[PDB]
Amino acid sequence: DGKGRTCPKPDDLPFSTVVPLKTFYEPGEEITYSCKPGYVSRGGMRKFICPLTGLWPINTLKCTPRVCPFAGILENGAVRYTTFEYPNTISFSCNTGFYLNGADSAKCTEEGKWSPELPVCAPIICPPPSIPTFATLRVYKPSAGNNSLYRDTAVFECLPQHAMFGNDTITCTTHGNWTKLPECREVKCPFPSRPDNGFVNYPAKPTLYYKDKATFGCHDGYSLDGPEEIECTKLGNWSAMPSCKASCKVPVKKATVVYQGERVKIQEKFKNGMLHGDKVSFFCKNKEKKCSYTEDAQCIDGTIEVPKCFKEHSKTDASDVKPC
Ligand SMILES: *[C@@H]1O[C@H](CO)[C@@H](O[C@@H]2O[C@H](CO)[C@@H](O[C@@H]3O[C@H](CO)[C@@H](O)[C@H](O)[C@@H]3O)[C@H](O)[C@H]2NC(C)=O)[C@H](O)[C@H]1NC(C)=O
Ligand SMILES: *[C@@H]1O[C@H](CO)[C@@H](O[C@@H]2O[C@H](CO)[C@@H](O[C@@H]3O[C@H](CO)[C@@H](O)[C@H](O)[C@@H]3O)[C@H](O)[C@H]2NC(C)=O)[C@H](O)[C@H]1NC(C)=O
Ligand SMILES: *[C@@H]1O[C@H](CO)[C@@H](O)[C@H](O)[C@H]1NC(C)=O
Ligand SMILES: *[C@@H]1O[C@H](CO)[C@@H](O)[C@H](O)[C@H]1NC(C)=O
């Protein structure tokens, strides 16, 4: 006692480590502060001898994280980060059009450097595309040397007499390959039958291929129940096969009717008969409630059923009676 003093357990400083660590020390004993790995201090390792007073000195040591080289700028991309100090991770991604050449993330090591090495963004690019069999291509600019860049496109057309299957355009994708490629096959259609009461035309040659046109027509009594022009489709048949159907003679001498939602005189509107499929609504009275309604009738291959309740006058035309 008096001379028999000791030093206490040393203070535990931020991110430090002390050796030898004991609960008390005789005077003359030595301790050694050192920053934890990943950290560093103004001056570094402090060393103290327990003095006779039993009081450890003042400790200048202040330990702070190492800082890895600045890494907040990724040419053509983006770095997510807190700080570039140990032991933080930082992650990377590229702007659109570019791919990441290197690791997606990196850690600041205790050694004070980035692991893995910081990546780089690079242009996504596709190689020259292959021409499918029986095709040419006539949309192709290589925008990157001989190679195409992301979202570039090429477009193929078949040969004459050949039918494409699949979209005609390919795009250079994110992964540096092109989108699904089309196929070009040869397609044949049979000869089209001439229709009863009409005619049909096509060019004078031994067999008929994809996108060949055939045009139809009817004799004066008749009209088509389909399109005037057809073509040879990809599946080896035609667009349609139209018939020549018979017109109807005006079913009555005089009457007002609805034709496509408008009142017309059937004698004026169909003076030269009704075409096949021409539909019309006739006016009939409801005898009981002294009002008027319509019922329909249609030309069907030279026949039109003038509805039962209609009556032809040389009281008034249901036309002129109020609606029900
Ligand atoms: C261009 O290259 C990419 C990348 O390799 C191709 O994408 C890959 O496509 C395959 C199939 O489309 C994916 O695999 C799987 O197929 C099975 C079928 O058994 C399916 O059940 C799974 O759900 C899955 O889709 C593969 O995951 C995918 N890879 C990537 C990274 O997306 C692509 O097909 C290529 N494009 C062309 C035109 O060849
Ligand atoms: C030209 O010829 C084709 C092929 O022979 C005709 O296609 C027929 O219709 C479809 C495909 O277009 C085939 O698939 C199935 O049809 C049913 C109809 O109920 C549909 O609901 C389903 O999705 C099913 O996949 C069908 O098998 C095929 N017919 C035959 C006999 O093979 C096409 O319609 C023709 N075009 C003209 C304008 O004549
Ligand atoms: C593509 O570029 C290479 C490298 O310069 C060159 O040798 C080659 O002739 C080019 N190909 C075409 C089709 O121009
Ligand atoms: C193929 O591509 C577009 C969209 O990618 C699609 O809407 C259409 O089926 C095709 N368009 C053209 C112009 O060929």
From Swiss-Prot:
Stretch list, region Sushi-like: 247-324
Disulfide bonds: 7-50, 35-63, 68-108, 94-121, 126-172, 158-184, 189-232, 218-244, 248-299, 284-309, 291-324
Glycosylated residue positions: 17, 133, 146, 167, 177, 237
InterPro entries the UniProt entry points to: Sushi/SCR/CCP_sf (IPR035976), Sushi_2 (IPR015104), Sushi_SCR_CCP_dom (IPR000436)
Keyword tags: Disulfide bond, Glycoprotein, Heparin-binding, Repeat, Secreted, Signal, Sushi
Pfam families to which the protein is assigned, alphabetical: Sushi, Sushi_2
Free-text tissue specificity from the UniProt record: Expressed by the liver and secreted in plasma.
One GO process term, biological-process aspect: blood coagulation, intrinsic pathway
Location of this chain's protein in the cell: Secreted
Post-translational modification: N- and O-glycosylated. PubMed:6587378 also reports glycosylation on 'Asn-188' for their allele.
Any single Gene Ontology cellular-component annotation: chylomicron
UniProt entry tagged with the keyword Disulfide bond: yes
GO terms of molecular function: heparin binding; identical protein binding; lipase binding; lipid binding; lipoprotein lipase activator activity; phospholipid binding
Domain (Sushi): residue spans on this chain: 5-65, 66-123, 124-186, 187-246
Biological function: Binds to various kinds of negatively charged substances such as heparin, phospholipids, and dextran sulfate. May prevent activation of the intrinsic blood coagulation cascade by binding to phospholipids on the surface of damaged cells.
UniProt name for this protein: Beta-2-glycoprotein 1
Organism: Homo sapiens
Gene that encodes the chain: APOH
